[PDB]
Amino acid sequence: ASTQGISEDLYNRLVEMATISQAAYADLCNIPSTIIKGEKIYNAQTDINGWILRDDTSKEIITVFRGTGSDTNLQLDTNYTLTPFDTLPQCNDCEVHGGYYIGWISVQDQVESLVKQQASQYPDYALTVTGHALGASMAALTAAQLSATYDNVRLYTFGEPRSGNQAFASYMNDAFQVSSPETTQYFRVTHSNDGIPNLPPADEGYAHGGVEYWSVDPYSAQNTFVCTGDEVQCCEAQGGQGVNDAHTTYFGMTSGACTW
Numbered sequence: 001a002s003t004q005g006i007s008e009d010l011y012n013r014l015v016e017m018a019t020i021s022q023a024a025y026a027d028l029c030n031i032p033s034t035i036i037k038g039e040k041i042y043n044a045q046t047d048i049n050g051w052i053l054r055d056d057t058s059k060e061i062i063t064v065f066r067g068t069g070s071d072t073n074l075q076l077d078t079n080y081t082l083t084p085f086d087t088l089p090q091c092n093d094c095e096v097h098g099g100y101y102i103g104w105i106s107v108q109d110q111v112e113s114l115v116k117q118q119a120s121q122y123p124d125y126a127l128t129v130t131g132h133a134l135g136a137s138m139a140a141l142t143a144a145q146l147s148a149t150y151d152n153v154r155l156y157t158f159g160e161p162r163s164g165n166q167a168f169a170s171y172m173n174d175a176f177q178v179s180s181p182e183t184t185q186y187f188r189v190t191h192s193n194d195g196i197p198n199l200p201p202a203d204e205g206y207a208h209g210g211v212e213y214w215s216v217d218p219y220s221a222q223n224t225f226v227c228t229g230d231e232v233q234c235c236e237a238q239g240g241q242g243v244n245d246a247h248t249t250y251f252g253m254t255s256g257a258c259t260w
C-alpha cells in the first residue's frame, strides 16, 4: 500500500498546487505567471475565502479555497458533527464534516455560479479544485459536487482532514478514478507527521478518499510515497496531532509568508 517516489512531472504539479493553496492565505501571493486571477469566492459570515482562476496555457479553470484564516473559520474546524451531503443526493448515505458542510452551503451557489461562469466560456478546459486544510476539505466537497456536472474535474488537497465518512470516500474514489494511481484525478497530499489528516477520528465514522501522496523530509519527488488502500500507513501512521510544523509547510512553502 506504499510505493516510494513519483515522476518529476507529477512532483512539479503537486508543488504547483501546493503553492496556489498556500498563497490563498495571502491574496494569491506569487502564483505562477500563466494564471489569471479571477472572481472571488466569499461569505463574510463563515469567512469562507477563495478564487476562481484560469490558466490558458494548461487550459484549466482552477478553484482555490483558503484554509483556516480566522476565529470564524476555526469554529468550522472544531465541529466534527457528521451530516448528510444533502446538496449532492446522488451520493448515497454520504455524510461530511459538519463545520465544513456549514462552510460549503454558505458558498455553494456562489461557487457554482462562478465556476459555470468560466466553464461556459471554456467548455474544454479542465476543472481543478485545490486547497490546504479547511480549504482542502472545502475543495473536496466542491470537487464532489462538480463531479456530477462536469467530467474533467481534478482535486489536489493539502493536509486535508477526513472530510466525510466511508460512503463519501467511495463516491469520491469512483468519481475520481482512485482505483488506480496512474488514473487518479484525486491527489490527497500529506506531509511528515501532519496532524490534520488524522482529524477527525476514523473511530467517529470518518474516512479518507483519494490516493495519498505523502511528502517526507527532505521533500523531493524521490521522497514522496504513493499510499493506497486501507492500512494504517504513511502520514496517518506517524501519530501527528493537531496543527504542527508538518501541517503548515508543504513542499517548503508555509501558509503565512510567501517564501515563493
Ligand SMILES: CC(=O)N[C@@H]1[C@@H](O)[C@H](O)[C@@H](CO)O[C@@H]1O
Binding pocket: 082, 083, 084, 098, 101, 102
Ligand atoms: C445533522 C445536521 O445538523 N444537519 C443540518 C442540516 O440539516 C441543515 O440543512 C444545515 C443548515 O444549517 O445545518 C446542519 O448541517
Ligand SMILES: CC(=O)N[C@@H]1[C@@H](O)[C@H](O)[C@@H](CO)O[C@H]1O
Binding pocket: 076, 079, 080, 081, 082, 083, 097, 098, 099, 100, 101, 102
Ligand atoms: C454550531 C454549528 O455551527 N454547528 C453545526 C451545525 O449547525 C450543523 O447542523 C452541523 C452539520 O453540518 O455542523 C455543525 O458544525
Ligand SMILES: COc1cc(/C=C/C(=O)O)ccc1O
Binding pocket: 067, 068, 077, 078, 132, 133, 134, 161, 196, 199, 200, 243
Ligand atoms: C479538521 O480539524 C481542525 C483543523 C484545523 C486547521 C488549521 C489550519 O489549517 O490552520 C485546526 C483544528 C482542527 O480541529
